Amino acid sequence: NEDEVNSCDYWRHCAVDGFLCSCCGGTTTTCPPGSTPSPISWIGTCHNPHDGKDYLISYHDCCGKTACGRCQCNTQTRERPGYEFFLHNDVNWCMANENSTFHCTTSVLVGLAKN
Amino acid sequence: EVNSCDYWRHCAVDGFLCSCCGGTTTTCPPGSTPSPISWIGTCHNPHDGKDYLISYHDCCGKTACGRCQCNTQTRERPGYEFFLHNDVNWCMANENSTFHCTTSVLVGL
Amino acid sequence: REVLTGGHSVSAPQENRIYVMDSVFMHLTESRVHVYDYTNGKFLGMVPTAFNGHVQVSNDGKKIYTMTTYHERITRGKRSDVVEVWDADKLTFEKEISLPPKRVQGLNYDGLFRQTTDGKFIVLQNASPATSIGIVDVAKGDYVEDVTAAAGCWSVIPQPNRPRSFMTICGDGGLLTINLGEDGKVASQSRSKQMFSVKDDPIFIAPALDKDKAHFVSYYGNVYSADFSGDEVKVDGPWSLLNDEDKAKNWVPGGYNLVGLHRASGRMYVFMHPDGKEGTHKFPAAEIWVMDTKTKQRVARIPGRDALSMTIDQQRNLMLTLDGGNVNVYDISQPEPKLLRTIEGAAEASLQVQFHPVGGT
Amino acid sequence: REVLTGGHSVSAPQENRIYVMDSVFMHLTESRVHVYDYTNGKFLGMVPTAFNGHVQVSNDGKKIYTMTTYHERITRGKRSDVVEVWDADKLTFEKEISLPPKRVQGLNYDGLFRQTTDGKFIVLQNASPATSIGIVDVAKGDYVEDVTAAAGCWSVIPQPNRPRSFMTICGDGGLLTINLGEDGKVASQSRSKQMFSVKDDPIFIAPALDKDKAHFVSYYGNVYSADFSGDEVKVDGPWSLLNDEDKAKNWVPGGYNLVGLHRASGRMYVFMHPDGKEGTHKFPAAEIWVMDTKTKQRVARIPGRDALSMTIDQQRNLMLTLDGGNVNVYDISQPEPKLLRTIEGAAEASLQVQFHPVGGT
Ligand SMILES: N[C@@H](O)Cc1c[nH]c2ccccc12
Ligand SMILES: N[C@@H](O)Cc1c[nH]c2ccccc12
Numbered sequence: 001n002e003d004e005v006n007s008c009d010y011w012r013h014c015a016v017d018g019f020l021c022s023c024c025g026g027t028t029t030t031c032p033p034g035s036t037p038s039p040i041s042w043i044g045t046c047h048n049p050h051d052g053k054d055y056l057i058s059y060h061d062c063c064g065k066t067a068c069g070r071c072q073c074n075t076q077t078r079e080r081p082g083y084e085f086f087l088h089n090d091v092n093w094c095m096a097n098e099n100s101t102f103h104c105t106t107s108v109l110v111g112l113a114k115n
Numbered sequence: 116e117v118n119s120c121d122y123w124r125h126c127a128v129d130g131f132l133c134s135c136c137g138g139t140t141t142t143c144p145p146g147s148t149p150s151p152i153s154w155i156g157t158c159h160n161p162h163d164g165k166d167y168l169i170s171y172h173d174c175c176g177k178t179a180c181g182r183c184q185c186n187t188q189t190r191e192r193p194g195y196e197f198f199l200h201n202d203v204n205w206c207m208a209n210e211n212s213t214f215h216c217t218t219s220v221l222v223g224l
Numbered sequence: 225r226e227v228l229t230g231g232h233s234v235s236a237p238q239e240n241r242i243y244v245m246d247s248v249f250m251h252l253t254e255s256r257v258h259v260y261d262y263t264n265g266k267f268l269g270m271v272p273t274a275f276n277g278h279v280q281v282s283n284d285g286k287k288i289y290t291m292t293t294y295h296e297r298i299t300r301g302k303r304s305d306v307v308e309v310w311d312a313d314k315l316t317f318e319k320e321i322s323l324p325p326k327r328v329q330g331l332n333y334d335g336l337f338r339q340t341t342d343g344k345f346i347v348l349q350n351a352s353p354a355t356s357i358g359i360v361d362v363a364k365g366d367y368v369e370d371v372t373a374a375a376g377c378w379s380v381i382p383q384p385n386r387p388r389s390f391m392t393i394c395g396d397g398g399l400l401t402i403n404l405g406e407d408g409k410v411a412s413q414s415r416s417k418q419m420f421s422v423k424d425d426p427i428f429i430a431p432a433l434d435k436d437k438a439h440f441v442s443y444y445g446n447v448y449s450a451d452f453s454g455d456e457v458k459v460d461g462p463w464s465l466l467n468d469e470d471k472a473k474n475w476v477p478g479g480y481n482l483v484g485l486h487r488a489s490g491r492m493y494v495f496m497h498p499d500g501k502e503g504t505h506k507f508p509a510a511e512i513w514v515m516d517t518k519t520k521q522r523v524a525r526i527p528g529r530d531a532l533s534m535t536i537d538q539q540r541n542l543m544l545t546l547d548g549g550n551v552n553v554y555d556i557s558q559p560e561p562k563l564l565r566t567i568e569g570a571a572e573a574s575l576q577v578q579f580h581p582v583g584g585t
Numbered sequence: 586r587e588v589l590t591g592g593h594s595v596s597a598p599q600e601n602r603i604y605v606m607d608s609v610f611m612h613l614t615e616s617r618v619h620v621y622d623y624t625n626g627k628f629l630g631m632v633p634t635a636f637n638g639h640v641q642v643s644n645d646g647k648k649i650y651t652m653t654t655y656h657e658r659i660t661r662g663k664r665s666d667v668v669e670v671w672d673a674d675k676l677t678f679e680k681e682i683s684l685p686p687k688r689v690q691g692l693n694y695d696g697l698f699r700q701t702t703d704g705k706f707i708v709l710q711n712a713s714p715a716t717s718i719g720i721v722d723v724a725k726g727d728y729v730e731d732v733t734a735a736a737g738c739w740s741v742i743p744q745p746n747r748p749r750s751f752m753t754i755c756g757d758g759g760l761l762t763i764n765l766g767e768d769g770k771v772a773s774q775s776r777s778k779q780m781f782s783v784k785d786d787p788i789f790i791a792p793a794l795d796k797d798k799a800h801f802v803s804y805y806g807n808v809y810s811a812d813f814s815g816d817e818v819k820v821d822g823p824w825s826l827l828n829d830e831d832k833a834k835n836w837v838p839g840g841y842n843l844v845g846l847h848r849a850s851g852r853m854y855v856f857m858h859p860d861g862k863e864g865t866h867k868f869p870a871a872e873i874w875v876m877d878t879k880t881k882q883r884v885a886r887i888p889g890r891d892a893l894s895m896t897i898d899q900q901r902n903l904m905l906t907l908d909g910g911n912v913n914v915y916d917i918s919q920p921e922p923k924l925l926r927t928i929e930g931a932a933e934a935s936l937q938v939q940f941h942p943v944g945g946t
């Protein structure tokens with residue numbers, strides 16, 4: 001449901017800080033045209049209500065275009081400060097891209113979490 | 116107010132008033148460069164009931180001030196009357212043309 | 225389980241796309257083009273355009289052209305003025321074309337960044353404050369001509385009936401026509417008779433452009449015309465947009481890209497407001513008036529929704545209007561425009577919207 | 586008759602000045618620092634900081650330092666990460682210091698861009714994403730050391746009692762202390778014993794910093810301390826911010842630069858909100874709590890005004906708070922803070938405010 005995935009409350013968006021790519025001309029798992037996926041990201045686990053399982057989500061950014069500005073989220077479930085760096089979302093996960101300009105952020109399902 | 120777009124001498128300002136940006140009507144905010152050229156307007160001064168020629172110099176080389184945005188158009192004309200036109204960047208002849216704010220400089224009657 | 229990928233094309237067909245040029249004046253170094261689907265208001269993507277970008281779409285619909293300025297350190301360092309060619313479907317950068325450091329920095333009037341009818345040349349306004357028109361050869365990716373004859377003139381009006389001719393409005397109230405050779409250099413030129421009094425009845429630069437003629441509205445609500453169907457441009461006017469009741473409440477035009485022409489019907493669209501006087505020429509539309517250019521009579525008047533700029537699609541009989549942030553979509557197949565939808569928050573500070581071209585003519 | 590002049594200094598004395606770091610997240614390539622007079626709310630000037638700038642004022646009060654990233658074509662082209670030195674009174678650029686292309690890009694926590702107490706070195710956080718702490722010799726205009734010993738740690742807490750020493754918080758729940766030599770290169774270091782459980786009681790990075798000790802608050806409302814009166818850092822805690830009534834309402838801290846210490850009194854200031862749970866650690870303040878760090882009891886609670894970040898001036902006994910756009914000025918000379926004024930529209934998206942230093946170095 002497009003409306004549903006475009007909400008900060010959608011289950012897999014539980015540690016998104018940035019603009020949802022699905023509102024920026026992309027989808028939950030594809031960058032808007034002309035923006036580049038980040039090879040690195042912060043990660044978190046989000047509880048899936050539909051099956052009651054926790055999933056590891058990789059919060060990759062799309063990079064190399066200026067701020068999308070749509071559907072800004074600042075959710076912080078299980079987010080931790082930078083001394084747990086890959087759980088931290090107050091940094092630009094485009095930081096190692098060929099162009100680090102932050103465009104939007106995605107929530108990519110990796111697989112089931114460890115219980 | 117002098118920080119209002121309704122202030123008499125701001126009658127052809129398209130931009131941010133420098134007096135709201137750390138400068139004054141006739142001084143650029145610190146670290147912004149005065150433009151040598153400008154658009155010109157004629158504005159009525161209520162204090163003495165006379166029209167004055169006003170030179171709308173910009174201050175340049177810093178990004179947009181963002182404060183006290185005005186879009187007044189008294190005696191403003193299109194680009195074929197080039198120096199009466201205020202929809203172009205009057206920082207264009209500066210070393211760095213990034214637009215910061217607009218001043219309202221009294222030339223005379 | 226999933227992998228984030230790039231390389232994707234715009235999700236909606238070209239025929240659904242519009243381009244909202246967001247100056248982002250409050251942060252003008254981050255201007256951009258927002259691409260929207262006009263049928264449903266969906267945001268499709270964007271092209272970043274640095275400081276005070278300008279945009280057009282190639283006549284064949286394959287490419288987006290931007291014009292902008294960079295500096296090595298933004299507010300200091302060496303300047304680079306460029307045209308960029310972007311793929312329209314992938315919204316990716318393809319090519320930079322170097323310009324001399326004098327391209328116009330100004331609000332997004334259509335006439336500052338245009339192309340020849342044949343699509344082979346981009347034609348742009350320079351102001352440094354020295355004025356001329358610059359010519360870019362798209363095929364070669366080169367700046368090829370600087371039109372000195374255009375000093376003291378402003379803006380580019382392509383002639384749709386010729387492959388590589390355009391006009392500009394001169395400070396003496398006449399028009400200059402430039403005809404380019406196949407190399408993009410000036411092959412010939414001509415000056416019209418005086419069309420309007422610069423002091424007494426200045427025109428807005430935005431043309432209501434037909435295939436072989438253009439109309440212009442004045443600060444006081446008169447209409448002037450330039451017919452370029454023959455070997456030389458023939459000028460006429462004024463006729464008034466205003467009846468006696470109109471004049472009594474001081475109705476006049478106001479806006480930026482404030483007029484349009486529906487070529488099949490000859491209807492001209494104009495943003496108008498009451499209580500006109502010195503300084504109101506850029507006021508938001510109280511109304512849109514629809515004028516029959518053959519009969520010289522108003523055929524409709526509708527609420528303006530505070531619009532400032534418009535554009536017309538001939539093929540689908542559509543008019544878009546823009547109030548700086550929101551885009552209104554109108555069906556103009558009938559004399560009374562019908563509002564279809566409003567796209568809210570399409571931009572923060574836009575004075576220009578354009579349709580993706582459909583067909584190639 | 587009048588002439589436009591430039592070259593002017595900031596109109597208010599240094600003692601009146603504050604710095605609001607505006608990320609402008611919606612247009613993050615046009616971040617900037619806004620300079621305000623806290624006594625009257627007057628806007629004094631600004632320093633542009635390109636993409637996601639960071640800022641601090643030199644300890645001697647003479648210069649403003651920024652850290653930012655440029656690219657040759659903003660969204661493409663070669664990257665330049667830099668520190669810039671700006672004159673504090675003229676708000677003009679003086680020099681650029683080249684950094685390796687890994688300076689931290691992130692929100693403006695104080696600890697990402699700091700200086701040694703002596704002011705000789707700028708001390709900045711890198712992430713490639715491997716973390717290290719970069720050292721810039723200001724006078725030489727050079728990046729002189731990369732403290733890769735801080736891998737797996739985050740943020741810089743200068744020791745205010747030593748000239749060229751700082752601490753960072755590590756993934757082992759302890760602190761790492763670095764002492765620099767005369768040229769800025771690492772001379773010695775030590776890790777503390779474990780201060781907090783990373784899994785069970787994570788701390789906010791923002792220190793409530795005394796001259797010889799730092800306090801930290803946790804996601805669950807506990808307080809930890811690191812004492813650096815000597816060369817070995819001694820750690821303690823937790824003690825709870827919360828009484829039984831507080832616990833019953835699930836009060837917890839929340840914010841960014843969310844704590845402060847008034848050194849003369851030992852009062853610690855913390856942003857708090859009720860109904861705390863997982864995910865609320867960045868929520869705006871419902872209240873500011875004022876704690877006596879010696880007695881470990883709350884001495885005041887006041888409305889938080891939705892603040893997220895704060896800073897303290899020791900000599901004038903002031904606290905500033907910031908909700909993202911507005912700055913509140915409080916007199917904290919007594920246990921109960923007194924609201925003096927609010928500066929509205931100081932920024933569009935700021936999480937950091939700072940006073941101009943007044944002590945001297
Ligand atoms: N998900 C992140 O890349 C979006 C972001 C959050 N905070 C930032 C600070 C700077 C740049 C990007 C970000
Ligand atoms: N007073 C002018 O320089 C401000 C301005 C108006 N329109 C612009 C377009 C581009 C850049 C600056 C401007």
Ligand SMILES: [Zn+2]
Nearest residue numbers: 047052053054
């Ligand atoms: Zn679960």
Ligand SMILES: [Zn+2]
Nearest residue numbers: 158159165166
């Ligand atoms: Zn008068």
